[PDB]
Coordinates of C-alpha atoms and ligand atoms in Angstrom, one line a residue:
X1 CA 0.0 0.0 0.0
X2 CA 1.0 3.6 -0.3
X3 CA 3.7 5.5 1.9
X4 CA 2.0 7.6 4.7
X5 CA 2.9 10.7 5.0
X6 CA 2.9 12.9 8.3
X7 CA 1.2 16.0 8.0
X8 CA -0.8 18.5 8.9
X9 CA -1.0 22.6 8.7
X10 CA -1.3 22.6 12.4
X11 CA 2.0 20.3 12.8
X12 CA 4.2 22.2 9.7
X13 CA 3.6 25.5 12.0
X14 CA 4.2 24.2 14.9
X15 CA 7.8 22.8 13.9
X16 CA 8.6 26.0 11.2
X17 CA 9.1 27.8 15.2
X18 CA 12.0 25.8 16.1
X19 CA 14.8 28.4 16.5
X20 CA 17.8 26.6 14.9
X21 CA 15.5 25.6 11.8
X22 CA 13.2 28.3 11.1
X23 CA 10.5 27.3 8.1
X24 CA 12.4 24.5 7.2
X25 CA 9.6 22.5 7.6
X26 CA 6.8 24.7 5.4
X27 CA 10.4 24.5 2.9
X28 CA 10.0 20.6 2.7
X29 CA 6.8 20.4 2.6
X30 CA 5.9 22.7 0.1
X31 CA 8.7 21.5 -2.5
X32 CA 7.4 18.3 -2.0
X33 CA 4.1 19.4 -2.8
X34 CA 5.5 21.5 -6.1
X35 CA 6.5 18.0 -7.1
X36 CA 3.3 16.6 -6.5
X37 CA 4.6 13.6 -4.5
X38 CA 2.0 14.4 -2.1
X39 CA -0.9 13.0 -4.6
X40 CA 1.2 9.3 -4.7
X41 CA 1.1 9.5 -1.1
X42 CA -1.7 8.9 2.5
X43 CA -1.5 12.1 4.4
X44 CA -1.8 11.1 8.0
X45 CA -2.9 14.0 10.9
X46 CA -0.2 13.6 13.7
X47 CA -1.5 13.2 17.2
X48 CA 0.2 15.4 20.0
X49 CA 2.3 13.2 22.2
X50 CA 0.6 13.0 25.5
X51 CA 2.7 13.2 29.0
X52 CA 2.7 9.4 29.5
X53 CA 3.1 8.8 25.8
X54 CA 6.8 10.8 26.5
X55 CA 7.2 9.0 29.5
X56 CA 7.2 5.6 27.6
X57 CA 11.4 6.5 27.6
X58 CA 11.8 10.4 29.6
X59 CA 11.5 10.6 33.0
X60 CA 8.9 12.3 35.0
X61 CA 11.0 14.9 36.5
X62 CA 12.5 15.8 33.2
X63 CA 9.0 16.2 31.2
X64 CA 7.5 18.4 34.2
X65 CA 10.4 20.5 34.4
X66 CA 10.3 20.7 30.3
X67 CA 6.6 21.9 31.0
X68 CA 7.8 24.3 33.3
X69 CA 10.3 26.6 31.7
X70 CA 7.8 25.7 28.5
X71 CA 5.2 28.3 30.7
X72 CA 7.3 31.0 31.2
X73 CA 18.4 19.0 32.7
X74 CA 20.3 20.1 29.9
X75 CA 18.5 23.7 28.9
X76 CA 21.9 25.4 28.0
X77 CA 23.7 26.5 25.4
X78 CA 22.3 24.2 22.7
X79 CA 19.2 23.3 24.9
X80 CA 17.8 27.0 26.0
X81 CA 14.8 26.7 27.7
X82 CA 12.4 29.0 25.0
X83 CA 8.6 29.7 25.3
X84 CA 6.3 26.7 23.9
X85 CA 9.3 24.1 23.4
X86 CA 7.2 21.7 25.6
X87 CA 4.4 21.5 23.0
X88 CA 7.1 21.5 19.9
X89 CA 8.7 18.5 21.5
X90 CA 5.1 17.0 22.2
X91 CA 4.2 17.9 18.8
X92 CA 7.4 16.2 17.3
X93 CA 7.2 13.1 19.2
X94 CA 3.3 12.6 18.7
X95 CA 4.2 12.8 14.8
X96 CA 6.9 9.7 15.3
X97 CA 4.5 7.8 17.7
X98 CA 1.7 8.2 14.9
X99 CA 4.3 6.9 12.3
X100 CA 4.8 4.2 14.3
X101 CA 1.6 3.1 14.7
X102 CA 0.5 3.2 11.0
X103 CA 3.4 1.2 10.3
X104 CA 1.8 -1.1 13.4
X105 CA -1.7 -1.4 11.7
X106 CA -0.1 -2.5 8.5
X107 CA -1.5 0.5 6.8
X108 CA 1.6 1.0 5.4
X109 CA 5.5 -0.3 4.6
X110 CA 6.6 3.3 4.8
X111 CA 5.9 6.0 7.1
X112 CA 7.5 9.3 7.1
X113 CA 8.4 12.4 9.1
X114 CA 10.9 15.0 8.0
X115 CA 10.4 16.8 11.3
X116 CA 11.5 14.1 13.3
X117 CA 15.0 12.7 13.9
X118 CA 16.1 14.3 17.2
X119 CA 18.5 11.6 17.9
X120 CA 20.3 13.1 20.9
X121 CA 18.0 13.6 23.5
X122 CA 18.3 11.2 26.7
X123 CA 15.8 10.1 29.1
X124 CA 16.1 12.8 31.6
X125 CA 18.1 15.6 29.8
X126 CA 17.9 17.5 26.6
X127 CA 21.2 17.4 24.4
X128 CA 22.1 18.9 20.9
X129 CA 19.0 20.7 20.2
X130 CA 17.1 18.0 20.8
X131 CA 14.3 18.0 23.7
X132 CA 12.7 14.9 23.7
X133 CA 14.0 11.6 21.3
X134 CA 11.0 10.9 18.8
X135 CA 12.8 8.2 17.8
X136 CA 13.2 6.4 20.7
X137 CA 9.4 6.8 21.6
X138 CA 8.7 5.8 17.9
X139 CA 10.9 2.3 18.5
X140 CA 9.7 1.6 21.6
X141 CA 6.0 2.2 19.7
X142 CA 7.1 -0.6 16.8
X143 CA 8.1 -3.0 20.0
X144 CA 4.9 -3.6 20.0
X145 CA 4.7 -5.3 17.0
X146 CA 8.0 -5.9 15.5
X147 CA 10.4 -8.6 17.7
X148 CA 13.6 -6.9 16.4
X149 CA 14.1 -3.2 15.3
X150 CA 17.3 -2.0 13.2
X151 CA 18.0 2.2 13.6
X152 CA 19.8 4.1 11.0
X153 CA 21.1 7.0 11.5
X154 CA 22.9 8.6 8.3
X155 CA 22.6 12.0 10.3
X156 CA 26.4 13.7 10.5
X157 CA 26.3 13.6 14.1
X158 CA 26.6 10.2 16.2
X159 CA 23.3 9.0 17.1
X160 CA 23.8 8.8 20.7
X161 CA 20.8 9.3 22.5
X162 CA 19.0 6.6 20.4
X163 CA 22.2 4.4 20.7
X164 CA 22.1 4.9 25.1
X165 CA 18.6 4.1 25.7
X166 CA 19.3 0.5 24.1
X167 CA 22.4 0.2 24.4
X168 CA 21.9 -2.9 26.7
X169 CA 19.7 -4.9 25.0
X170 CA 20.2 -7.0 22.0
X171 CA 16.5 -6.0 20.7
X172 CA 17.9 -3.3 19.2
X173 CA 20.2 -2.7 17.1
X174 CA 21.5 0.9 16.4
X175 CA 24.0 1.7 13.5
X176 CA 25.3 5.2 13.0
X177 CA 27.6 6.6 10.2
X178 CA 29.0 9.7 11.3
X179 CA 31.7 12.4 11.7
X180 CA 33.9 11.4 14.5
X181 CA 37.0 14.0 15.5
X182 CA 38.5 15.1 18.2
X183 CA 36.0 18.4 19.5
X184 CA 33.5 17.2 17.5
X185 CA 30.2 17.0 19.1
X186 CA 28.7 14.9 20.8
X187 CA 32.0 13.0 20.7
X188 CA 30.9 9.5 21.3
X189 CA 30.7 6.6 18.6
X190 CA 34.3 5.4 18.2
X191 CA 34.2 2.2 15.7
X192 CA 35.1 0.5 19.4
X193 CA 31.4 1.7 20.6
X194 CA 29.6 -1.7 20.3
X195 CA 26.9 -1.2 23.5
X196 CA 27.1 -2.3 27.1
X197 CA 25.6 -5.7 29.1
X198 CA 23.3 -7.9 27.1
X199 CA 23.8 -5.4 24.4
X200 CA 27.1 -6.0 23.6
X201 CA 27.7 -5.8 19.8
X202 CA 24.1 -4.6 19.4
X203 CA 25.3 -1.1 18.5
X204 CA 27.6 -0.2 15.6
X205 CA 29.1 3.3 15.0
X206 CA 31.4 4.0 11.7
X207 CA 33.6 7.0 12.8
X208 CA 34.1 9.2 9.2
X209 CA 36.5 12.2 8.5
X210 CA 35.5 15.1 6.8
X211 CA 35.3 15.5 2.8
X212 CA 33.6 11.9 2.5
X213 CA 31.1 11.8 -0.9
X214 CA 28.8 9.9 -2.4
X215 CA 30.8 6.6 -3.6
X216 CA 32.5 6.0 -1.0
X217 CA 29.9 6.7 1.6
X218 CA 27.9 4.0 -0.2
X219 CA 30.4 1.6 -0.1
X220 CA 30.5 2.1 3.8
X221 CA 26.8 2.3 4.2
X222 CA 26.3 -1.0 2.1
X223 CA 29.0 -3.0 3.3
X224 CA 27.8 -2.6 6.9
X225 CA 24.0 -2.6 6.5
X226 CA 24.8 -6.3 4.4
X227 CA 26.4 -7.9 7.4
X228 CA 23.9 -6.6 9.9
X229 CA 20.7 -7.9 8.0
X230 CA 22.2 -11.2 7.4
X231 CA 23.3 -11.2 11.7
X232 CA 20.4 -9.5 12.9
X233 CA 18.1 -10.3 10.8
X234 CA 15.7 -6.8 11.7
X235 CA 11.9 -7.2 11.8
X236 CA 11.2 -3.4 11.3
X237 CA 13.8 -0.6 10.6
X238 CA 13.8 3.2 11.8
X239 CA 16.1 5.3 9.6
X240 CA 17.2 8.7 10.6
X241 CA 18.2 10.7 7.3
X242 CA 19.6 14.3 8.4
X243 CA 20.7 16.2 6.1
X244 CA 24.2 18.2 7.4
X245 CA 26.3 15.8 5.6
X246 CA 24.8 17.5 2.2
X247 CA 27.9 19.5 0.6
X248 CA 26.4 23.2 1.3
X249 CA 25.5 22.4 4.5
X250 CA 27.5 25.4 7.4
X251 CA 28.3 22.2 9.2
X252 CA 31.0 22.2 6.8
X253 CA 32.1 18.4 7.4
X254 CA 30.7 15.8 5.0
X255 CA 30.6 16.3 0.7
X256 CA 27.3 13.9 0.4
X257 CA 24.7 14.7 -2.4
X258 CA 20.7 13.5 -2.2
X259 CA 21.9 10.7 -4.8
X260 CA 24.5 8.6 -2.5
X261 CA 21.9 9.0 0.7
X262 CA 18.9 8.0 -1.9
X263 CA 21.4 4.6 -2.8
X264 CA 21.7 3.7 1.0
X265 CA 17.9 4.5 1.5
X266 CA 17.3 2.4 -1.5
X267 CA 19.5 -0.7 -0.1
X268 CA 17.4 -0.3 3.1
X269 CA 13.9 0.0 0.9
X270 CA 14.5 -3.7 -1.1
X271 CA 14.7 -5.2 2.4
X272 CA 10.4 -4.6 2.5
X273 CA 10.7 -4.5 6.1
X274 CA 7.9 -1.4 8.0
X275 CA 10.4 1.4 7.8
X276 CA 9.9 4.6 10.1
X277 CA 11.6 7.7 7.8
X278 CA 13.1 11.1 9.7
X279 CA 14.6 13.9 9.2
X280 CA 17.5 15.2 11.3
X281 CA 20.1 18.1 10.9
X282 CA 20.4 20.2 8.1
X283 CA 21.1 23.9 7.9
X284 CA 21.3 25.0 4.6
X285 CA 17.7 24.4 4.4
X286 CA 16.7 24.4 0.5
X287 CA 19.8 21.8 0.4
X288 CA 17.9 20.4 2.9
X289 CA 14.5 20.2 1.0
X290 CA 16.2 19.5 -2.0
X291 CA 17.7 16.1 0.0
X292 CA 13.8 15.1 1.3
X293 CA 12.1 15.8 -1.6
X294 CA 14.8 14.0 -3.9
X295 CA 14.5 11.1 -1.3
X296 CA 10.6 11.2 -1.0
X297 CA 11.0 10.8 -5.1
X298 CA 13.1 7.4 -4.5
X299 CA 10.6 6.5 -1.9
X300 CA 7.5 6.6 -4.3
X301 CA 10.2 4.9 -7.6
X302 CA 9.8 8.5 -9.1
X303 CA 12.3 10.5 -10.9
X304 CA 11.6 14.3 -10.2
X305 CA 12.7 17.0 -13.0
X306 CA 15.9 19.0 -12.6
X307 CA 13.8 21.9 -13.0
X308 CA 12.3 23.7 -9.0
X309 CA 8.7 23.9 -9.7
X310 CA 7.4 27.8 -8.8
X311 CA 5.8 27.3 -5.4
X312 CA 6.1 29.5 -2.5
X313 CA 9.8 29.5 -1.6
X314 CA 11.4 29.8 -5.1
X315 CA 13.5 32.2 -4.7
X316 CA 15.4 30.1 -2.1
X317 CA 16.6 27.5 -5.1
X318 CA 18.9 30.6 -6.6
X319 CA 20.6 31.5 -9.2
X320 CA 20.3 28.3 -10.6
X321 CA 16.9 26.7 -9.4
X322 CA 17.9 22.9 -10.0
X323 CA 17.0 19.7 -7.3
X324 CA 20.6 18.4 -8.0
X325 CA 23.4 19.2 -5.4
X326 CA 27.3 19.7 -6.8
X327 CA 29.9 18.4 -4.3
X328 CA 32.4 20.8 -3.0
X329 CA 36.1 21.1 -4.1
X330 CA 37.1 20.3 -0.5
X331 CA 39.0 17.1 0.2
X332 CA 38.5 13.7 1.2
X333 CA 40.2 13.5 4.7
X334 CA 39.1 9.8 4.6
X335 CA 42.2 7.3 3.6
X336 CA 41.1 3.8 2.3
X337 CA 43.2 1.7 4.6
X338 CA 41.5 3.8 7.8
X339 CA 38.2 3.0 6.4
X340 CA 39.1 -0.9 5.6
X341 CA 40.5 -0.8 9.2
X342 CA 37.0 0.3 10.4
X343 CA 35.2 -2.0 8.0
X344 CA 36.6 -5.2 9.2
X345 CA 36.6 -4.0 13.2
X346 CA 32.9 -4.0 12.4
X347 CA 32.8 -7.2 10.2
X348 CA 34.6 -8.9 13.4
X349 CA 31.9 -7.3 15.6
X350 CA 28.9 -8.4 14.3
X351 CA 30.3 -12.3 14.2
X352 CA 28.8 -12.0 18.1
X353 CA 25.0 -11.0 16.9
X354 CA 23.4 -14.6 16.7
X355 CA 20.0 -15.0 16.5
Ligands
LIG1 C1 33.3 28.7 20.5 N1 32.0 28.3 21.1 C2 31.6 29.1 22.3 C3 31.3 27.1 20.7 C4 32.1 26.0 20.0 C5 31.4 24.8 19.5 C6 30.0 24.6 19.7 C7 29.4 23.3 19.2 O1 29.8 22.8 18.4 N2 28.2 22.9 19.7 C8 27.3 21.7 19.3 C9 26.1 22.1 18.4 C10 25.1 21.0 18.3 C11 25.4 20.0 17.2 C12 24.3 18.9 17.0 C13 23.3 19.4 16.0 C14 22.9 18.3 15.0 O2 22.8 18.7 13.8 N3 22.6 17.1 15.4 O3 22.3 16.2 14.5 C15 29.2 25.6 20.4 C16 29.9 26.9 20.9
LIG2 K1 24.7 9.5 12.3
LIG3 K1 21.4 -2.1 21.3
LIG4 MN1 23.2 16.5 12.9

């Protein structure tokens, strides 16, 4: 049946406030529309996240205190406590809940939410601009259902709150590709990260330099994503697609286009397991809705034209008002032995993941 698609006027408001991101959301949405992507697809009405829905992971303390400073734990620098984030983070995790449960009901293979994807978040403290993990709450949602879930998180930054709240058990298995350096936040996810407990080997994390592109970011993506299916064997898979590795992007790191993310999403789409989509980073945001829409397109089997449609934020896609990305001239920091070296301390890992 046909991909469902999280949205509603209501929600795209809601999340075009979020400080670090303004209108990126109405941005996404509305080139996805121009492309008319949204006719091929079910438009599904998120449901707010309720206090005990949130609690399903984040503690009780944390969520009243979020409510708190909401009125008027990790609320600095890249947390700051702002007016409304409560219902934002509700919002956002109620979206990823609702995904999850479509996806329950068989309703659909494919769910998506480009708002979502706020991997950093922990139980009881906010983290990297993240206030509450919609991810999280959307696995622990697909529990229900699905014996073994497999998280993806092609986002530039490790997925680490995802990654610590199962990182002891071996019904989860969390897989991150990411920029790993020294000052480089959130600075966890070392290729010798591989979970805690009962978990052990249950999380893998490829550490990547900067200047990586598509090819070889494929040839990563694939090679790992081959020998977990074939040890893990998934039953459902959430897949965290931020866009800061696009080249463009002020994060200034990774040299990926839409094309090399839309192989690994491909890889992961022939496996016709339920699969939760999300957003993520991504701050040059028409790259950004350029990436999504371009990756809703290989979600439906449709090639979009080169050409930006008019719609409401045209004048973002200048001077040249193309979908297609051009890599930067900056270098590939990555050397091929480091990245066989990494390669094969994974290969060796996932040996340990019987089922
Ligand atoms: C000089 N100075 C005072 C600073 C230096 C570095 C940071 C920083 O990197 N912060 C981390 C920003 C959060 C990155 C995670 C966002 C994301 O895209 N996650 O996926 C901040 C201030
Ligand atoms: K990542
Ligand atoms: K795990
Ligand atoms: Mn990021």
């Amino acid at each position: 049946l046909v991909p469902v698609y999280i949205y509603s006027p209501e929600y795209v408001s809601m999340c075009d406030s979020l400080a670090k991101i303004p209108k990126r959301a109405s941005m996404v949405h509305s080139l996805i529309e121009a492309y008319a992507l949204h006719k091929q697809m079910r438009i599904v009405k998120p449901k707010v996240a309720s206090m005990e829905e949130m609690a399903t992971f984040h503690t009780d303390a944390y969520l009243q205190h979020l409510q708190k400073v909401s009125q008027e734990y990790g609320l600095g620098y890249l947390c700051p406590a702002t007016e409304g984030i409560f219902d934002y983070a509700a919002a956002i995790g109620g979206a990823t809940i609702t995904a999850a449960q479509c996806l329950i009901d068989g309703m659909c293979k494919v769910a998506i939410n480009w708002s979502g994807g706020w991997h950093h978040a922990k139980k009881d403290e906010a983290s990297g601009f993240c206030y509450l993990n919609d991810a999280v709450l959307g696995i622990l949602r697909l529990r229900r259902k699905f014996e073994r879930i497999l998280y993806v998180d092609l986002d530039l930054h490790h997925g680490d709150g995802v990654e610590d709240a199962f990182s002891f058990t071996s019904k989860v298995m969390t897989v991150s590709l990411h920029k790993f350096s020294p000052g480089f936040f959130p600075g966890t996810g070392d290729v010798s990260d591989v979970g805690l407990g009962k978990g052990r080997y249950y999380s893998v994390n490829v550490p990547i330099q900067d200047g990586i592109q598509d090819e070889k970011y494929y040839q990563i993506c694939e090679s790992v994503l081959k020998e977990v299916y074939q040890a893990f064997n998934p039953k459902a898979v959430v897949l965290q697609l931020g866009a800061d590795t696009i080249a463009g992007d002020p994060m200034c790191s990774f040299n990926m286009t839409p094309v090399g993310i839309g192989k690994c999403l491909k890889y992961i789409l022939q496996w016709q397991l339920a699969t939760l989509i999300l957003g993520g980073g991504g701050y040059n945001l028409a790259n950004t809705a350029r990436c999504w829409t371009y990756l809703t397109g290989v979600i439906l089997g449709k090639t979009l034209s080169s050409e930006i449609p008019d719609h409401e934020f045209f004048t973002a896609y200048g001077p040249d008002y193309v979908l297609e990305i051009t890599p930067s001239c900056r270098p590939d920091r990555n050397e091929p032995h480091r990245i066989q070296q990494i390669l094969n301390y994974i290969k060796g890992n996932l040996k340990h993941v019987v089922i």
